[PDB]
Scaffold this active site. Structure first.
Site, mmCIF file in Angstrom:
data_model
loop_
_atom_site.group_PDB
_atom_site.id
_atom_site.type_symbol
_atom_site.label_atom_id
_atom_site.label_comp_id
_atom_site.label_asym_id
_atom_site.label_seq_id
_atom_site.Cartn_x
_atom_site.Cartn_y
_atom_site.Cartn_z
ATOM 1 N N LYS A 1 0.824 -1.195 0.000
ATOM 2 C CA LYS A 1 0.000 0.000 0.000
ATOM 3 C C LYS A 1 0.858 1.245 0.000
ATOM 4 N N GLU B 1 2.241 9.439 8.859
ATOM 5 C CA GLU B 1 2.923 8.625 7.882
ATOM 6 C C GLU B 1 4.410 8.593 8.195
ATOM 7 N N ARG B 2 5.110 7.674 7.526
ATOM 8 C CA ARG B 2 6.502 7.371 7.844
ATOM 9 C C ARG B 2 7.485 8.290 7.128
HETATM 10 N N1 LIG Z 1 4.642 -4.733 -7.907
HETATM 11 C C1 LIG Z 1 5.284 -5.093 -6.773
HETATM 12 N N2 LIG Z 1 6.197 -6.076 -6.797
HETATM 13 C C2 LIG Z 1 6.849 -6.470 -5.698
HETATM 14 N N3 LIG Z 1 6.655 -5.934 -4.491
HETATM 15 C C3 LIG Z 1 5.763 -4.948 -4.333
HETATM 16 C C4 LIG Z 1 5.001 -4.451 -5.472
HETATM 17 N N4 LIG Z 1 4.206 -3.477 -4.990
HETATM 18 C C5 LIG Z 1 4.438 -3.377 -3.656
HETATM 19 N N5 LIG Z 1 5.379 -4.254 -3.293
HETATM 20 C C6 LIG Z 1 5.960 -4.535 -1.984
HETATM 21 O O1 LIG Z 1 5.166 -4.061 -0.919
HETATM 22 C C7 LIG Z 1 6.076 -4.140 0.158
HETATM 23 C C8 LIG Z 1 5.544 -3.367 1.322
HETATM 24 O O2 LIG Z 1 5.917 -2.024 1.132
HETATM 25 P P1 LIG Z 1 4.737 -1.055 1.523
HETATM 26 O O3 LIG Z 1 4.158 -0.432 0.344
HETATM 27 O O4 LIG Z 1 4.885 -0.325 2.820
HETATM 28 O O5 LIG Z 1 3.626 -2.123 1.755
HETATM 29 P P2 LIG Z 1 2.393 -1.417 2.404
HETATM 30 O O6 LIG Z 1 2.378 0.011 2.108
HETATM 31 O O7 LIG Z 1 1.253 -2.159 1.757
HETATM 32 O O8 LIG Z 1 2.720 -1.632 3.845
HETATM 33 C C9 LIG Z 1 7.381 -3.575 -0.371
HETATM 34 O O9 LIG Z 1 8.481 -4.244 0.239
HETATM 35 C C10 LIG Z 1 7.312 -3.870 -1.854
HETATM 36 O O10 LIG Z 1 8.337 -4.761 -2.283
#
Ligand SMILES: Nc1ncnc2c1ncn2[C@@H]1O[C@H](COP(=O)(O)OP(=O)(O)O)[C@@H](O)[C@H]1O
Ligand SMILES: Nc1ncnc2c1ncn2[C@@H]1O[C@H](COP(=O)(O)OP(=O)(O)OP(=O)(O)O)[C@@H](O)[C@H]1O
Ligand SMILES: Nc1ncnc2c1ncn2[C@@H]1O[C@H](COP(=O)(O)OP(=O)(O)OP(=O)(O)O)[C@@H](O)[C@H]1O
Lengths: 160, 508, 466, 157, 73
Positions: free
Chosen positions: C162, C188-189
């Site tokens: 996300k 947010e981070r």
């Molecule tokens: N198309 C993609 N392919 C591989 N990994 C993805 C993709 N889209 C998102 N991610 C993964 O989502 C993981 C979580 O990151 P983050 O976006 O913080 O997840 P979230 O926001 O859902 O917590 C990341 O380590 C990233 O590798």
């Protein structure tokens, strides 16, 4: 001992008391009242009855007629309130109430409490301190200050 | 506690002695979000509207000892507490006139269109008692499905309780909505409820009112996100007032209603405000009390309606009033007390299946998923006549499913059934937006009547062959008028059909 | 700004946490939100308004830190119940929630001010238009149409990417601009945040827009306040620009704070301990969204889906208020698929076949059918394995794993996560894919090849090697 | 109770009952109905037309509109006259409308009470009401207390 | 016994908690209560659990002790 509940009641008090300027008089009323409340055989009877009128009448009745009209309509408030049971607390409040305006009292240092009316903290206070000359009395003071300094002391021993 | 004045205590301090002053207007002590503890207007009328700063009037239901408070639709923040009340003498009433068919309005009847024209008569309260028993006339008046399986699956007499029930995001605002179209040139008067809706829906809706340019034959009010629930709480009751001007006008009408529950828990938020214990999910015990009120409204009067308002400039005749329930389900949970009390309440039932929706099938509903106690009284001797096989095919196709699993267990007798069922299956089709000829209904009879199934056997050619079929109509279409006009089954007429089967031979 | 002289005070009545219990003059009166000052030992603090409580004592709210306060404290007040400077100068430097310039640059900004309250257009007031946008989105741009001004919905809790799927949102968003737009993030981070700042620098795009960004660990009172920051923020622009675009964060947090404070107000929660007005709050927030005849605006939005409980009434108000939205499959994710969206799930109201012609509507429908089917038999296999596979079915299944496998393609900016780059995509090429796949045109086509793959030409080059 | 379903034309059955009340006996019997679909009454009217059951016609009012308390309350009303005729010792029969529609009733009662929702807001008198009914009907030394089934059921199993 | 297959199926001695669970309409209210008759000799007196069910139950029951005889035990 909600007693905080006192205020809206208690508050209008000083104000009425202010406005009515009774506080000598109102003060009388309160004295009288707490007295009335105190009555225990009465007290058993006191929560006895449902009809508020009955109590306004009977209470007011044996009362010895120290009552006021403002205090009649108003007593009728406390009964209408139904909260009246605990009323004496307000006098305490009323005290502070009366006290509030211009008053002062005292905490015993180690002996007995002057309750001096001295409105300057540490000053009118100091005035009392110097005013000893009451310096005479022991009244457990020495055990207290020696034991309390001693208490800070052993406290430091612990600290040691 | 409630006493709390302390300053008026000063007042009451001796004024406990003397009061005896009944204002029409008392100060409103303190408020939360439109609802205010308040005191004054000594006389009480239950559920009296109460005027305010600004035009607004409010109301409180709960008789509240020694003080009471209330809320009003509107700006709640402007106000300031302890203001002298503005008493409103009238309980709420709503304007009643028959001339709005082309225009829609705020909950006030305030045209949101801002037509600027006002065609209505007087004003009249929203809720009122329903007609006496036997004052109602049972009514065979059919209705126009447009989903073949709508009528064929179910007949429609005037006045019945509708169901729509089906999942969120299922299409069912435009699966729900898409329904409304078939009405069109019907000529009966109608309105559609709106619960809290997003405006764009309103706009595009209006565009559709270009699509069906008509748009003016009938009007509907609206609910939106800003709206005060009170607005909603009455909003079904609100429309109740109006359609009562049609049935009460002797006219016959249907009014859509949907998405109530939103209003409902909103009424719970009232209960929170009411600081009053609700039922499960904070549901008011009322529930079917409310649903009792609103839901209770619809009728087809008898010549008791000969007793009219004018009772009567006669016009000794019976009015009828229908309407549209729509239900929605998260996960499709039947336990819904809303669907429970309601489910119990519903006279006939409609379920949409996210399977066929999930099949993407034009329809999502399931045979037997949806049923109505009213039954086939509305179905026409031809229509009534020809319609039987559905259930079995339903069953059949449904039942057909059984052996589909055990692959390849069955012979041609089966295959002829099953094939026939695939065929009927195909036979079901509908546009996302289409009108219905209902002479087109006659079409279906062929598959029954005409072998028609072996013909155009090819899936593609069956399908297309429907279109080609439809076209062939132009070749001869005299009797359809009579047909459309006749609305009756003539054995002799059946000849015209038999010969038409040649046109089938003629048309591919 | 102007004194704001004297005004005396409420005294602090009672210490309930951050809840402000304090008492002012009889005449002293606010709005349901109104301007109050008070200096902590350190600094002036402010507690936003109370609803309505008596005795000059009402409640109130704060973005600050409650501890270390003495009771009975006098409290000041400002005239303007809310005052929000409205500049166009803002695009340079970010600001506090107070709007205090969050960049190191001090900014005079602008005198024009705003307040939280804002209101919606008339029935006739907005404009409605079909202009749409298409991009390197393998499906969704393909799988779904995107009209101009449209508010895109994000589905899911995080971990879904996300933030990283959100990062895709950055990309495509980043990919195409052709205008002026602004988005921000709150609760947010920072690693993200400071990164977007450094990369923003590198980008040097900040001229086009600035955004105050809220922090995760931030105090609630701010968090609550942040929406008003949004609305007012737009208000200038919508006036200013006819057009805008943005994105929205952690609206789960929105709900979260809101509920959190509800009973703190001495209110009973909405169900699942939600907050009783929470929906009202929502119709408020989504209602805040608008696009007008005079001007329209686009933005895309995200709230953490709590836990993939779809029944979530939060999720209800989602779809309810939902405008556009997307969904993601933690199986598909779990499938190791990089893209990982719930395709079967997501849907475009705007999608119209007439709009889309038939070929789109049709083909899409077909794939949908396949999905229906593979889903459909998926059971039967799992039960029986495939041993009994009806020929035709079996074939379809091939097409199935293939088609799923097929959707995936590389992304240029994506090389970060996986060193592999990728490319923008062309719709027509997609349309071709529709046929050939529909054809299954390449009969020998490799399954492994199709995944995260290039065009039928490219996949044909793979096909050569792979 | 009669396990029954719509479309059965069970009214035909009912008629046969009354006809056997005056035919088989002196029924001195009346039907009870409450909370129901508007239609049958007209039909019933029609039927009361069709029948001579107009002799002897008490019309138990049948509407659901009333206060759930009002609605539920109808029992003793239903009782007292059969109490007359069975208490007349005269054979007396009466028809019963709804069973677990009355279940819904007794619940709606207890809830309306603000009496604490029992388990699932269970109704308090289900035994006292149900067995109050029981307490009503018996072959009584004076006369049997004979009454027709009510079928209404919460899901009708 | 009172029940062959249960007797054989389970033994019984005095003081031991016995349990029973079963469907209404059969035989439940009836159950084995006739195994009171099994007492016959009735060396140990006993009392039937009474529950509020039925005056009729009370009645045919009364009639039943009668049929057996005798309840004075
Ligand atoms: N198309 C993609 N392919 C591989 N990994 C993805 C993709 N889209 C998102 N991610 C993964 O989502 C993981 C979580 O990151 P983050 O976006 O913080 O997840 P979230 O926001 O859902 O917590 C990341 O380590 C990233 O590798
Ligand atoms: N014959 C049809 N076959 C398939 N879909 C159709 C047909 N007619 C209309 N629809 C579709 O229903 C779709 C979505 O309807 P809608 O926007 O109402 O979803 P929704 O109803 O809002 O969600 P919910 O189902 O929860 O109300 C529309 O895109 C419309 O094309
Ligand atoms: N499986 C069976 N074998 C032999 N007799 C049976 C059987 N089932 C029922 N009966 C007969 O039915 C009687 C038990 O019925 P009874 O109504 O007491 O059952 P129940 O479960 O107690 O009913 P309820 O509990 O609903 O009163 C026994 O006297 C017996 O004659």
């Amino acid at each position: 001992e909600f007693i905080t509940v006192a205020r809206p009641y208690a508050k209008a008090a000083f104000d009425f008391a202010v406005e009515h300027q009774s506080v000598e008089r109102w003060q009388d009323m309160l004295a009288f009242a707490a007295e009335v409340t105190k009555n225990e055989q009465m007290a058993e009877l006191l929560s006895g009855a449902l009809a508020p009128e009955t109590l306004a009448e009977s209470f007011i009745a044996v009362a010895g007629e120290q009552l006021d009209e403002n205090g009649q309509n108003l007593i009728r408030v406390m009964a209408e309130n139904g909260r009246l049971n605990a009323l004496p607390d307000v006098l305490e409040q009323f005290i502070h109430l009366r006290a509030v305006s211009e008053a002062t009292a005292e905490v015993d240092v180690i002996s007995a409490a002057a309750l001096s009316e001295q409105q300057l903290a540490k000053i009118s206070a100091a005035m009392e301190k110097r005013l000893s000359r009451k310096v005479k009395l022991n009244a457990k003071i020495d055990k207290s200050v020696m034991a309390g300094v001693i208490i800070r002391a052993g406290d430091m021993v612990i600290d040691g | 506690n409630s006493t709390e004045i302390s300053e008026l205590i000063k007042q009451r301090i001796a004024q406990f002695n003397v009061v005896s002053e009944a204002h029409n207007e008392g100060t409103i002590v303190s408020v939360s979000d439109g609802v205010i503890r308040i005191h004054g207007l000594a006389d009480a009328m239950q559920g009296e509207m109460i005027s305010l700063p600004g035009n607004r009037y409010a109301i409180a239901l709960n008789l509240e000892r020694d003080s009471v408070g209330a809320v009003v639709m509107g700006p709640y923040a402007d106000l300031a507490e302890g203001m002298k009340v503005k008493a409103t003498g009238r309980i709420l009433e709503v304007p009643v006139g028959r001339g709005l068919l082309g225009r829609v309005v705020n909950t006030l009847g305030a045209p949101i269109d801002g037509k600027g024209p006002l065609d209505h008569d007087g004003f009249s309260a929203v809720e009122a008692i329903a007609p006496g028993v036997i004052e109602r006339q049972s009514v065979d008046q059919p209705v126009q499905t447009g989903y073949k399986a709508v009528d064929s699956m179910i007949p429609i007499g005037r006045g019945q309780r509708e169901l729509i029930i089906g999942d969120r995001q299922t299409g069912k605002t435009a699966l729900a909505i898409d329904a409304i179209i078939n009405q069109r040139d019907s000529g009966i008067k109608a309105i559609y409820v709106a619960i809290g809706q997003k405006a764009s829906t309103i706009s595009n809706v209006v565009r559709k009112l270009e699509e069906h340019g008509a748009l003016a034959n009938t009007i509907v009010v609206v609910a939106t996100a800003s709206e005060s629930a009170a607005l909603q709480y009455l909003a079904p009751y609100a429309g109740a007032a109006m359609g009562e001007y049609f049935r009460d006008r002797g006219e016959d009408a249907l009014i859509i209603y949907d998405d109530l529950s939103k209003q409902a828990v909103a009424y719970r938020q009232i209960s929170l405000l009411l600081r009053r214990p609700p039922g499960r999910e904070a549901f008011p015990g009322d529930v079917f009390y409310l649903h009792s009120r609103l839901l209770e409204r619809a009728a087809r009067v008898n010549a008791e309606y000969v007793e009219a308002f004018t009772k009567g400039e006669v016009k000794g005749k019976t009015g009828s009033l229908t309407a549209l329930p729509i239900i929605e389900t998260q996960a499709g949970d039947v336990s819904a007390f809303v669907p429970t009390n309601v489910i119990s309440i519903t006279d006939g039932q409609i379920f949409l299946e996210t399977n066929l929706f999930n099949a993407g099938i034009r329809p999502a509903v399931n045979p037997g998923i949806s049923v109505s106690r009213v039954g086939g009284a509305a179905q026409t001797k031809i229509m009534k006549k020809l319609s039987g096989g559905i259930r079995t095919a339903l069953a059949q196709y449904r039942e057909l499913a059984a052996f589909s699993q055990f692959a390849s267990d069955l012979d041609d007798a089966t295959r002829n059934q099953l094939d026939h069922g695939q065929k009927v299956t195909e036979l079901l089709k509908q546009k996302q937006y289409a009108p219905m000829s209902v002479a087109q209904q006659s079409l279906v009879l062929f598959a029954a009547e005409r072998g028609y199934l072996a013909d155009v056997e090819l899936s593609k050619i069956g399908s297309f062959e429907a279109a080609l079929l439809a076209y062939v109509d132009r070749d001869h279409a005299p009797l359809m008028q009579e047909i459309n006009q006749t609305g009756g089954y003539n054995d002799e007429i059946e000849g015209k059909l038999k010969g038409i089967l040649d046109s089938f031979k003629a048309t591919q | 700004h102007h004194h704001h002289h004297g005004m005396a005070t409420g005294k602090i009545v009672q210490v309930i946490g951050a809840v402000v219990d304090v008492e002012f003059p009889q005449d002293a009166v606010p709005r349901v939100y109104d301007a109050l000052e008070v200096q902590n030992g350190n600094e002036r603090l402010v507690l936003e308004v109370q609803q309505q409580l008596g005795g000059g004592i009402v409640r109130t709210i704060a973005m600050g830190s409650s501890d270390g306060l003495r009771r009975g404290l006098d409290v000041k007040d400002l005239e303007h119940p809310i005052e929000v400077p409205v500049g166009k100068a803002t695009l340079g430097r970010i600001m506090n929630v107070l709007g205090e310039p969050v960049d190191m640059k001090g900014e005079i900004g602008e005198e024009e001010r705003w307040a939280i309250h804002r209101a919606a257009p008339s029935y006739e007031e907005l404009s409605n238009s079909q202009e749409l946008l298409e991009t390197g989105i393998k499906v969704i741009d393909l799988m779904a149409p995107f009209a101009k001004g449209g508010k895109v919905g994000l589905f899911g809790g995080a971990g879904v990417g996300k933030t990283v799927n959100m990062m895709e949102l950055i990309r495509n968003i980043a990919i195409e601009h052709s205008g002026y737009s602004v988005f921000a993030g709150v609760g947010e981070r920072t690693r993200e945040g400071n990164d977007f700042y450094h990369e923003m620098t590198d980008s040097n795009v900040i001229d086009k827009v600035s955004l105050v960004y809220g922090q995760m660990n931030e105090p609630p009172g701010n968090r609550l306040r942040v929406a008003l920051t949004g609305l007012t923020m737009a208000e200038k622009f919508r006036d200013e620009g006819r057009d805008v675009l943005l994105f929205v964060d952690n609206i789960y947090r929105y709900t979260l704070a809101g509920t959190e404070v509800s009973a703190l107000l001495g209110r009973m929660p909405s169900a699942v301990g939600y907050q009783p007005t929470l929906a009202e709050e929502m119709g408020v927030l989504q209602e805040r969204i608008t696009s007008t005849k005079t001007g329209s605006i686009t933005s895309v939005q995200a709230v953490y889906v709590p836990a993939d409980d779809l029944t979530d009434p939060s999720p209800a108000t989602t779809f309810a208020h939902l405008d556009a939205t997307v969904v993601l499959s933690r199986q598909i994710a779990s499938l190791g698929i990089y893209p990982a969206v719930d395709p079967l799930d997501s849907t475009s109201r705007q999608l119209d076949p007439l709009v889309v012609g038939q070929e789109h509507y049709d083909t899409a429908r077909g794939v949908q059918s396949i999905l229906q089917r593979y889903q459909e038999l998926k059971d039967i296999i799992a039960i029986l394995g495939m041993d009994e596979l009806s020929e035709e079915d079996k074939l379809v299944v091939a097409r199935a794993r293939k088609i799923q496998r097929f959707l995936s393609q590389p992304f240029f900016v994506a090389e970060v996560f996986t060193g592999s780059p990728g490319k923008y995509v062309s719709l027509k090429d997609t349309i071709r894919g529709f046929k050939g796949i529909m054809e299954g045109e390449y009969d020998h086509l490799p399954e492994q090849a199709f995944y995260m793959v290039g065009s039928i030409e490219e996949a044909v080059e793979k096909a050569k090697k792979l």
